[PDB]
Write a protein that binds this ligand. Structure first.
Ligand code: NA
Length: 395
């Protein structure tokens, strides 16, 4: 008689993709898994074998640019409260006489936390980004929150948040409720966790290893004259670059022994790029892994899949973030001695080239990558996380 594990997330790729493999494995293990998700991701979720439970989220669909979330931290954070308040009852009612044995959820789902409590079952939080360490509150939250909190808006945000939890028997402060889960699996490698020396390892277990995505075998496969392959697979931060994808051509084009995979405004759109040399393939859509598995350098936006897979593929990286969060990845990657940090004003054909020739020729870069790949192997992937989830399953 199967345990019911209820998963919760929102319609955003970065909050669904990282755990799809885990959900897939839990189903493969015989658990009955339901997955609360908006309709746009129903197909995506059903493909894991989980039953989608549909609800209406007022958050921006997975198909939205980052003008659409908002410009200050209260603009970033309020939407999750607003959504949660109108999603809670939908979800409570959809699960009314089918109370799960265990609640799993991406960090964005406030309803999941509330319902786990209301139902008196354990919740397991699944983080696709870094988590709080012991000390973050004083260290980091304050000043960041220091100002918005003495504004009329921030006092009302926090007021409404209190009241809403109070409605649901919860007395934890909202910052506690939101940012400090009792139990969490962190889906990024420890190597990419700030001040990771201080994460509480009763609460949090790191499971950041590649287990999965398209584990496909063969994507594109190296032309058998390609000494050094450089995939440029998010290298940018998704913004217009009629100079950066072209700076990449000038860096690697006709560079003896090199071969350059570019991936563009992934809607085609150009004959900017111009007179492509013979060792330069450009595409709108690539299989970042089979490539990375045979690539020797990776120019990247450096988000989770991207910082992770290059580490996972022991591929040194030229870090081209263009976002404060990936500025922390960049100096973290760079901090580990396996990448050099670059912004677009900086990522010019010359400096791309000499940095590329540094990194691929640095035998210690390779040794460090080996080191990190081994630590991620240990952390475990899908089976690992699935184990940890079972180990909670009021069973
Ligand atoms: Na490699």
């Amino acid at each position: 008689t199967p345990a019911h594990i209820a998963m919760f997330s929102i319609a955003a790729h970065g909050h669904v993709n990282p755990s799809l493999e885990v959900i897939r494995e839990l189903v493969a293990r015989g658990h009955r898994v339901t997955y609360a998700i908006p309709p746009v991701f129903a197909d995506k979720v059903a493909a894991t074998g989980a039953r989608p439970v549909l609800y209406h989220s007022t958050l921006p669909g997975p198909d939205a640019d980052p003008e659409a979330w908002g410009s200050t931290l209260l603009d970033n954070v309020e939407p999750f409260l607003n959504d949660a308040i109108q999603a809670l009852p939908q979800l409570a009612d959809a699960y009314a006489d089918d109370i799960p044995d265990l609640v799993l959820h991406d960090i964005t789902s406030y309803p999941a936390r509330v319902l786990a409590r209301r139902w008196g079952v354990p919740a397991v939080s699944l983080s696709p980004n870094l988590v709080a360490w012991k000390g973050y509150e004083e260290e980091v939250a304050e000043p960041m929150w220091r100002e918005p909190r003495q504004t009329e808006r921030g006092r009302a945000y926090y007021a409404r948040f209190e009241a809403w939890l109070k409605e649901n028997g919860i007395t934890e402060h909202p910052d506690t409720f939101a940012s400090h889960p009792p139990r969490s699996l962190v889906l990024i490698p420890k190597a990419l966790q700030p001040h990771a020396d201080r994460v509480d390892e009763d609460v949090y277990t790191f499971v950041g290893a590649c287990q999965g995505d398209r584990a496909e075998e063969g994507g594109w496969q190296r032309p058998a004259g390609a000494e050094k392959v450089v995939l440029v697979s998010l290298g940018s931060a998704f913004t217009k670059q009629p100079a950066f994808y072209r700076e990449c051509v000038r860096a690697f084009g006709n560079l003896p022994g090199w071969h350059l995979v570019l991936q563009i405004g992934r809607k085609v759109t150009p004959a900017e790029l111009g007179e492509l040399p013979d060792n330069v393939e450009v595409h709108d859509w690539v299989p970042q892994l089979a490539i990375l598995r045979q690539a020797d350098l990776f120019v990247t936006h450096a988000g989770a899949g991207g910082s992770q897979e290059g580490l996972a593929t022991a591929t040194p990286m030229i870090a081209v973030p263009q976002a404060v969060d990936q500025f922390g990845n960049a100096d973290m990657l760079q901090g580990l001695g396996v990448a050099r940090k670059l912004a677009t004003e900086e990522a010019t054909a010359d400096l791309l080239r000499e940095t590329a020739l540094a990194l691929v020729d640095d035998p210690e870069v390779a040794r460090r990558l080996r080191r990190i790949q081994a630590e991620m192997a240990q952390e475990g992937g899908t089976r690992r996380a699935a184990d940890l989830i079972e180990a909670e399953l009021p069973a």
